[PDB]
Symmetry: C2
């Protein structure tokens, strides 16, 4: 006070001087200084400290071997996961912006044909179509687009093991002109889990637990850097308030109402009036 | 980048604007800004983030219902517990400096007489004696000093349930001249638990897990603020490198070698040559 308090923080930071790995040293000295500056800034009480301890403990304890990672959910809801993803995917070009994966990608889904339907359940029919291009605006041929989205129930198959195998998942490909087309249902918004400590924090914050409606993409092609991103429905009431801060301006796409037999359907002939979202992905060379 | 990254952190901080409790708002906005400044400063990689996630998870999972709180141990070893204790016990007077309790205090220990021995086990005999005074240097009469220390094995009774009930614990009292006297054994240094994630972090840091030798005091008297502190052996080889940063300059006390029948033994007549530590505690009025 203020020498006494400063001396405790110096010793804590200095304790790491000896780490053989200088990156680990770097990280721990930074983390300790920030942690101690936080505690000092707010003048954390002992009772508040006990709350932080009970909360962290409960968050770790909510992590099971299996289907629930509450620490990741805490990282997501405090914006750390999206910050980390941006830092590691910095871009100066017009390449499509990235996002986290989320926890819901599944390996070994069906390779689907151009315009193939992946919606095996009820929903509002949609055609999601567009191109995969390079930064010069030329088509990337044979790119692979792995896509996944929740059902109407706000569950991914088989996060929800009751949905059919491969439902609302598929691996599609861009054609000779870089065009792709996916038949699906309009994605719907869904809440993140709130039955753990993260739900308590969101409740105390008066924050809702919703994600805006989205479609997940992972796009790969020889010569290009892997792209993992989301396309978010333009109209979604949660676009400005994504619980995990996934939304970026350029990843929004409008689901337009189109006439039956619209001529601008990537060569498909749609039998009824339908919803359509058009998007051009831009990939970075490697 | 750098707008993109700044926008994610702003949204994460701003998400808490709505908290009904403005203290909770204050704390969470500060914590989020510090957390995001840390991640940005070091440019944390995705693999490092996964390590932080695995580590936090493992720390929470190491907490049992019962005898082990790994999050508290992490708070201690990163200097957060001592920082919190200082912030909440700020003093401008010559009052004795405070420390954390530690996890080892036990209720209902024996009320011991002046100079009573609390060492029921093997060790080097010591007389710890002194006074409890006010800030004006006058004796505090009938103060109660709850004291506890590890055995030679580096365990507290019955953290180590094999030691006798009350071993190296007692509740002593200051007399009409504020004098107290405690017979015990010279405290020995002991390591903190390293079989969990904190041990891994200390290993990576090339930090040892030792505490310098100490005696724990909690002193209470009517009219005065409760004092919880440690007296650390002056000669200890870990005094400058306490794993949990407990040591302060003024809490060190010399265990001097004294002659049999020394006249400066608080009125006790010690039968053999012995170790002696003299300390004057200064309590704050309430
Ligand atoms: C993986 C990356 C992330 C890791 C980063 C590590 C740390 C980040 C995680 C910390 C999150 C802690 C959030 C705790 C939630 C607090 C809470 O839920 O209860 C609220 C009241 O409690 C509080 O106000 C105290 C909050 C204390 C927070 C201290 C955290 C400090 C961490 C350091 C501690 C040790 C290292 C309820 O509000 P109230 O009920 O009073 O609000 C009033 C409104 N009502 C009554 C109508 C509800
Ligand atoms: C309660 C209050 C406290 C709460 C605050 C909340 C957060 C604070 C806790 C974080 C502590 C994390 C410490 C992790 C230990 C890392 C480790 O042990 O392995 C080292 C290598 O790993 C690493 O280098 C990566 C370290 C990554 C740390 C990231 C932490 C960021 C937290 C945010 C994440 C999500 C919110 C081994 O070194 P090496 O083996 O490479 O070293 C080389 C030397 N050898 C090979 C000889 C050993
Ligand atoms: Fe999703
Ligand atoms: Fe101790």
């Amino acid at each position: 006070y203020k020498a006494v308090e400063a001396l405790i923080s110096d010793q804590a930071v200095d304790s790491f001087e000896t780490s053989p790995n200088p990156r680990f040293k770097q990280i721990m000295q930074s983390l300790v200084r920030h942690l101690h500056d936080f505690v000092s800034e707010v003048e954390l009480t002992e009772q508040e400290w006990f709350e932080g301890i009970r909360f962290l403990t409960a968050t770790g304890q909510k992590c099971d071997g299996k289907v629930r990672q509450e620490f990741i959910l805490l990282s997501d809801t405090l914006g750390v996961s999206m910050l980390v993803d941006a830092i590691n995917h910095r871009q100066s070009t017009n390449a499509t912006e990235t996002t986290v994966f989320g926890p819901f990608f599944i390996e070994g889904m069906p390779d689907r044909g151009y315009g193939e339907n992946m919606a095996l359940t009820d929903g509002v029919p949609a055609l999601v179509y567009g191109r995969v291009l390079d930064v010069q605006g030329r088509p990337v041929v044979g790119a692979v687009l792995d896509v996944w989205q929740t059902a109407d129930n706000g569950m991914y198959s088989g996060q929800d093991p009751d949905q059919p195998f491969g439902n609302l998942r598929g691996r599609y490909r861009s054609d000779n002109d870089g065009c792709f087309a996916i038949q699906t249902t309009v994605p719907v918004c869904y809440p993140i889990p709130t039955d753990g400590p993260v739900g308590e924090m969101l409740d105390a914050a008066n924050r809702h637990a919703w994600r805006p409606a989205h479609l997940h993409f992972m796009i790969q092609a020889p010569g290009y850097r892997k792209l993992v991103t989301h396309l978010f429905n333009s109209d979604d009431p949660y676009l400005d308030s994504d619980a995990v801060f996934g939304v970026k301006g350029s990843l929004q796409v409008k689901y337009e109402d189109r006439p039956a037999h619209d001529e601008d359907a990537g060569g498909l002939d749609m039998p009824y009036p339908y919803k359509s979202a058009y998007y051009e992905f831009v990939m970075e060379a490697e």
